[PDB]
A paper describes a structure:
Mpro is a cysteine protease that cleaves at no less than 11 sites on the replicase polyproteins. Initially, Mpro releases itself from the polyproteins through autocleavage. Then the mature Mpro forms a functional homodimer and transcleaves pp1a and pp1ab. Given its essential role in the viral life cycle and the absence of closely related homologs in the human genome, Mpro is considered an attractive target for anti-[name] drug development (12–14).
Further, we solved the structures of [name]-[name]-2 Mpro mutant ([name]) in complex with six cleavage substrates from replicase polyproteins. Substrate selectivity is revealed using structures of the [name] mutant in complex with six individual native cleavage substrates. We demonstrate that the subpockets (S1, S1′, S2, and S4) which are endowed with an exceptional selectivity are important for selective and potent binding. Additionally, other subsites such as S3 and S2′ to S4′, which have less specificity for substrate recognition, may also be used to enhance inhibitor binding and to specifically target Mpro.
Residue numbers in the entry:
A (entry chain C), B (entry chain C): 301 to 310
C (entry chain A), D (entry chain A): 1 to 302
The structure:
Amino acid sequence: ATVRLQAGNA
Amino acid sequence: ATVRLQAGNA
Amino acid sequence: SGFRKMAFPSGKVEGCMVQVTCGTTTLNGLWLDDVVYCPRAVICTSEDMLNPNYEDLLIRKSNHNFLVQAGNVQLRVIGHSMQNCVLKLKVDTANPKTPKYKFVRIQPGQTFSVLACYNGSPSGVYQCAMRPNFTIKGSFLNGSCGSVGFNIDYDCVSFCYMHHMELPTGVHAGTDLEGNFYGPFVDRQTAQAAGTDTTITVNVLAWLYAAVINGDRWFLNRFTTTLNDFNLVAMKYNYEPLTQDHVDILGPLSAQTGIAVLDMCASLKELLQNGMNGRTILGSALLEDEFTPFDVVRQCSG
Amino acid sequence: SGFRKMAFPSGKVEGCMVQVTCGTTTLNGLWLDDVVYCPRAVICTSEDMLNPNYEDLLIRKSNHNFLVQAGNVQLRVIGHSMQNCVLKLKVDTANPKTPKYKFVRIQPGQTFSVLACYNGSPSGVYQCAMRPNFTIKGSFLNGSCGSVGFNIDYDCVSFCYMHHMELPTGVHAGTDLEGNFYGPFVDRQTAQAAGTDTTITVNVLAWLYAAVINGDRWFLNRFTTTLNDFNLVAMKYNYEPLTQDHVDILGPLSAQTGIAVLDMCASLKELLQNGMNGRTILGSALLEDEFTPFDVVRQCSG
């Protein structure tokens, strides 16, 4: 598994 | 024991 | 991911907190439009508090007996009245920070955010449930009287609690914002005790769903149970009976996780009978009952 | 009375939260004076995130590639630069709500309040500790990137954390406000793992003092222990070694309760060896390590 960069979708 | 009304001192 | 006891952002309520002083007694008030709401206990001296006659104490006061301070600004009181256990102090300035708001009374088992305050100055925020016996397990010291509890929906603050007092067991009691106490309590320094409490079953089940959404699933099992058979176990462990309406409110969480409510009920039954055997759920070693289904859905991934 | 995980009132930070959008990526920014601080991950598309070269991605952007929205108002970006893992977006308007503030880096074992945010809109507030392995056990969903953690002393906000990402174990990692990560992590979607964690011993002892101040004292005993003998037990149970400085910081609480620190250490030793045997402390069935001595003193009666 990988890190998730928790930005959002515009 | 009794209830304490939790006001403060001015 | 993760699951925390989360409060609502407190800013809209911070802008409403003021200090109310009458004589040598001071506490917090809530300033909305041109009215300051506060506990009527502010008109009591120490000696008045065992057996106060509040209508008597109030008629001996004038507007200028009430010092209301908002930050650096003193507010001029231009009218006062008593409504149940709160005072309404009409002031000459409408609060420019007044949010959209409602005065709602909450049900036992529901949650709300508390803005703890002292001398009109906010000091902390935390989440509380109204216990089945109408107390709250809060964190309050002398001077906290008049701190409020609330929920926020969109940009509207639904005020549901004003804090008054601490019972001998260390738990807290207060009123809604029209000054009607939650539970069988009165605002005087007498021996009072709450009814026996119980655990909020639907909330424990909601929290078990949160845990599954977050990857704790060691407590699940292949079994099911009926509502009636579960409620038999609930009564043994001093849990509230579960209703079809609770099963209905748990619908969305049960659909999200694929775990039938009655299947989760069977998981809860085993936890009650077996304990946890040294394991934890969402970081707790006991069954948490102060999250509602709404709290879970609001905070957890969809 | 009572003891709750309490956050700081969030209002001063709510007034600083904005939305930053670059392309189809959006997240939160922190608007102080005429600068908006946000994670540099905002210049990444999905495809960039496995192996981003941020200096490369940034040089291909202009000021007008950054859409900053504060409530209804769009803020005009007039300059941009990268500092470690954050961007500094100079805007043409100074935030009129800017509090007194500091950028501080915190130590593992210390606590702070998190204002969880989505699309620049605050959604909840909760208290966190920085774990010994530099992660935090937060509550964060997609869109939370750029939410900040802070403490408030008098009226000054000491910002200490900006949120970036979630590790595969469900815990969270971020940077201080000059964009330097806490712990051995980088802002890309790769397999990373934290070092092994440990329990924050001084904090557990502080919380035991809180419990005594609040009337839980079943865990006390007539025994004492030496620092060296306690630390022998601590290593067995993956607790941090206790130092004389921790004993010193616990001074005020030990004087308030009349329980010597080394006496409380002996109480902790027995709890570690015996477990709790079905009892609770301040409402928990495990040993809580996310309250500092300061948190205890701040919240408990004197």
